[PDB]
RNA sequence: AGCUUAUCACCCCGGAAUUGGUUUAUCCGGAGAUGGGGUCUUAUGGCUGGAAGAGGCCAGCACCUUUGCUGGCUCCGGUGC
């Protein structure tokens, strides 16, 4: 499913993790996809699709919260929100997500 | 009273697995650490003014007395279940 894709891409494209970063990411246009974690709050989230849609990038959501999608990553450290800077043999930027 | 001074807390860069900081007591970190650089409360503490002309320890003077003058030092530290 869904994880499989994030589990490529860990390693065949460039990728970040975090809050801080993903907001630096997606000013200068480097970022093609964002996940949000339900976990987070609204007022956090909210945020992110806001300079997202000023950045033209879609925004994915996950059926989740913060501690399964870091596990869903690769690192066992749980993360809020992940960009994608750019996808390598995966295709989650081009896909029904 | 002036200058100055701490834990705690917060801010800028930065980005983490070969996980790391860390209290006597294991909490914290991608809701962003460790690190580098700063801000803040001023309990407390330090120098200075108050204030050494104050207090204290000592030597001479002679006053049936009422009393005083001349004077010196009043300094530098250390440790602790």
């Known amino acids: 499913s869904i994880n499989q894709k994030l589990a490529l891409v860990?390693?065949?494209g460039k990728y970040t993790l975090?809050?801080?970063s993903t907001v630096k990411s997606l000013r200068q246009g480097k970022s093609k996809l964002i996940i949000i974690a339900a976990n987070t709050p609204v007022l956090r989230k909210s945020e992110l699709e806001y300079?997202?849609?000023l950045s033209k990038t879609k925004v994915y959501y996950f059926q989740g919260g913060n501690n399964?999608?870091?596990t869903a990553v690769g690192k066992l450290f749980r993360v809020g929100v992940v960009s994608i800077l750019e996808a390598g043999d995966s295709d989650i930027l081009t896909?029904?997500?």
């Open 10 to 12: 860990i390693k065949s």
């Open 18 to 20: 975090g809050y801080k």
């Open 51 to 53: 300079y997202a849609m």
């Open 68 to 70: 399964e999608l870091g």
């Open 95 to 97: 896909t029904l997500a």
